[PDB]
Write a protein that binds this ligand. Structure first.
Ligand SMILES: CCCCCCCCCCCCCCCCCC(=O)OC[C@H](CO)OC(=O)CCCCCCCCCCCCCCCCC
Ligand SMILES: CCCCCCCCCCCCCCCCCC(=O)OC[C@H](CO)OC(=O)CCCCCCCCCCCCCCCCC
Ligand SMILES: CCCCCCCCCO
Ligand SMILES: CCCCCCCCCO
Ligand SMILES: [K+]
Ligand SMILES: [K+]
Ligand SMILES: [K+]
Ligand SMILES: [K+]
Lengths: 106, 103, 219, 103, 106
């Protein structure tokens, strides 16, 4: 099964600064990676699909890039509401798997 | 409309049905098998087409028994359908040549 | 002839936008793609995006914040890159390059230096640098020209309209009080000067100015 | 010239047109998709040929929706064109055999 | 996306000596690598295409080799005019990417 590594587990940034979350797959998965945001006591919410596709309703601030084994979720100018845990998930091979998550700290 | 043209049309419609059904069934058969890649519908439809045309790039393919049985149905349906179009074209040329000869 | 022509410089105030141009000549094919590459001072080459003039579609580097919008005018064979809402992070040399659809950049433009600043444009003052009366000359003599008080970068300095290239050193500019300053050095056989004229030509793209200064021995 | 020979010739010319157009369009459809390899014209033409003949080595193939639609057009054009040549050959043999039988 | 690693960042050689620049791709890219030379204050200039193909106008002194993930740009008998930064670039997969560059020092 595909292992998704998210490191560092915690990312500290200053307000308005650009931030990048990392996701590395144990094997090549093309662009079959999706990102979710989960705030304290909230349910996961889809942010980006297929590595870089925008989801309607999500601030333009969010963007994704990468293909193969290395992926990145970026936030241009972070703000308080972005404080949460971020998870990547792959759908290239069965079974779907989740990364261990990265917390954004401001 | 002559038989060969009707049969050709019918074969096309049947092929499209087999491609859609094959795509649905391939995902059903492959999810649950560790390592399988033919597990989402959009790429499964693409897979069904490149299988029916006998191109077979190797980017996607079934690993389970049932997925492989589905693949064989897709293959046979594609070969038979395109083969029937060829047969219809031959019949058309044969008919035209007979005329050109006064028959 | 120059296949890709780009303007020398563009000064942009923070937050404003600018539209860079790239005029192409030479053979043109439906398979040509025009690329744009960004290079900050002292750093490497960064791919920005590409556009296919024959169809008008453009693709962009996903790894970086999108600052550009690419377009192309077929009738004038010109490609454009609109950079919007710029900050000092956007200050850099922006090259355009042509690819024949086969993967490599056959040719590059000279590049456009974009400076994002609130400061105002200022043409340079060109002063002569001739040896003092007590300087002993060897088989060679060194002359030069001082170019100070200009903004923004860059300036191009040539000697005798370019006919004089050997023995020429142009030093990197230094920034002080919102103004740049640099000098250029030229060395010619001591016997040829002043018999044979030596003049430096200073072009400042940002101000659309180009001046000449003949170097003659001191009074 | 009889119909089947003219149709065969026409099919060949049309196939060459589809290969060139398919090569151009495949690059147009694939650039912009991270990981795509069908992105330069020379290899895209090679890809179009091995697709039209249904060989499909797997060295190159489309990953996007539009690139895949282009691929399907190339596949169908190739199969139909070679199928039409077969039909023309059959018509030729049929005509010759009739003669050999005195008809 | 394909990462192109150029190490060392600086190469020191004596006059007339043969020199070799290294370029390693994060994944196999066949021979889809191209080399450019960029002198101080100059624009990039194509030196070698598809790993080893000569470009008309470039001194015979320049040659390239390699395939897969490891490539080399060589200069037989270096001279002053070769002082510049050298970059590799791949076109095997989208998007095209550049190596970080190696400076030649004499
Ligand atoms: C002629 C057939 C061409 C098929 C192209 C598939 C491309 C898949 C893709 O890369 O598409 C990519 C695209 C996302 O980028 O997916 C999408 O949303 C696009 C939707 C595409 C197709 C419809 C879904 C498949 C339906 C199969 C039958 C299922 C019955 C239940
Ligand atoms: C029969 C078709 C054979 C195709 C062989 C392609 C080999 C590509 C290559 O490995 O060629 C290698 C070679 C470089 O080594 O590339 C070149 O320059 C050679 C040029 C080759 C082909 C012309 C370019 C493609 C045109 C497609 C239509 C585009 C319309 C716009
Ligand atoms: C054509 C083969 C039958 C359809 C696939 C059935 C899959 C059942 C679950 O494994
Ligand atoms: C045959 C499918 C249409 C041609 C390809 C169009 C690509 C548009 C850009 O994505
Ligand atoms: K095949
Ligand atoms: K394969
Ligand atoms: K393989
Ligand atoms: K086949």
């Amino acid at each position: 099964d595909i292992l998704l590594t998210q490191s560092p587990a915690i990312l500290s940034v200053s307000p308005g600064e650009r931030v990048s979350f990392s996701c590395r797959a144990s094997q090549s998965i093309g662009t079959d990676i999706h990102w979710y945001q989960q705030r304290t006591n909230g349910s996961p919410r889809l942010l980006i699909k297929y590595a870089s596709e925008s989801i309607s309703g999500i601030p333009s601030r969010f963007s994704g890039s990468g293909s193969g084994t290395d992926f990145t979720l970026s936030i241009n100018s972070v703000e308080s509401e972005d404080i949460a845990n971020y998870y990547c998930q792959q759908s290239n091979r069965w079974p779907f798997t989740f990364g261990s998550g990265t917390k954004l700290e401001i | 409309s002559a038989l060969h043209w009707r049969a050709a049309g019918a074969a096309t419609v049947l092929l499209v049905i087999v491609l859609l059904a094959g795509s649905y069934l391939a995902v059903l058969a492959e999810r649950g098998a560790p390592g399988a890649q033919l597990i989402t519908y959009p790429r499964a439809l693409w897979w069904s087409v490149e299988t029916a045309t006998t191109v077979g790039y190797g980017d996607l393919y079934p690993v389970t028994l049932w997925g492989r049985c589905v693949a064989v149905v897709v293959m046979v349906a594609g070969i038979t359908s395109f083969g029937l179009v060829t047969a219809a074209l031959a019949t058309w040329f044969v008919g035209r040549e007979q005329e050109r000869r006064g028959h | 002839q120059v296949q890709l022509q780009q303007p020398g410089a563009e000064l942009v105030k923070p937050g404003a936008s600018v539209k860079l141009s790239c005029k192409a000549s030479g053979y043109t094919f439906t398979s040509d793609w025009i690329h744009w590459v960004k290079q900050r001072p002292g750093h490497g080459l960064e791919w920005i995006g590409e556009i296919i003039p024959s169809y008008g579609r453009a693709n962009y580097n996903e790894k970086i914040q999108k600052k550009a919008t690419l377009t192309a005018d077929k009738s004038s064979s010109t490609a454009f890159m609109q950079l919007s809402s710029l900050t000092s992070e956007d200050s850099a040399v922006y090259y355009c390059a042509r690819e024949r659809g086969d993967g490599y950049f056959a040719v590059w433009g000279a590049g456009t230096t974009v400076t994002v600043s609130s400061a105002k444009t200022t043409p340079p003052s060109v002063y002569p640098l001739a040896p003092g009366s007590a300087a002993q000359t060897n088989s060679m003599v060194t002359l030069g020209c001082l170019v100070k008080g200009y903004f923004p970068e860059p300036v191009t300095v040539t000697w005798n309209s370019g006919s004089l290239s050997s023995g020429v050193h142009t030093f990197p500019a230094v920034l002080q009080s919102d103004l740049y300053t640099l000098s250029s050095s030229v060395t010619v056989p001591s016997s040829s000067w002043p018999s044979e004229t030596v003049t430096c030509n200073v072009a400042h793209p940002a101000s659309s100015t180009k001046v000449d200064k003949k170097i003659v021995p001191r009074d």
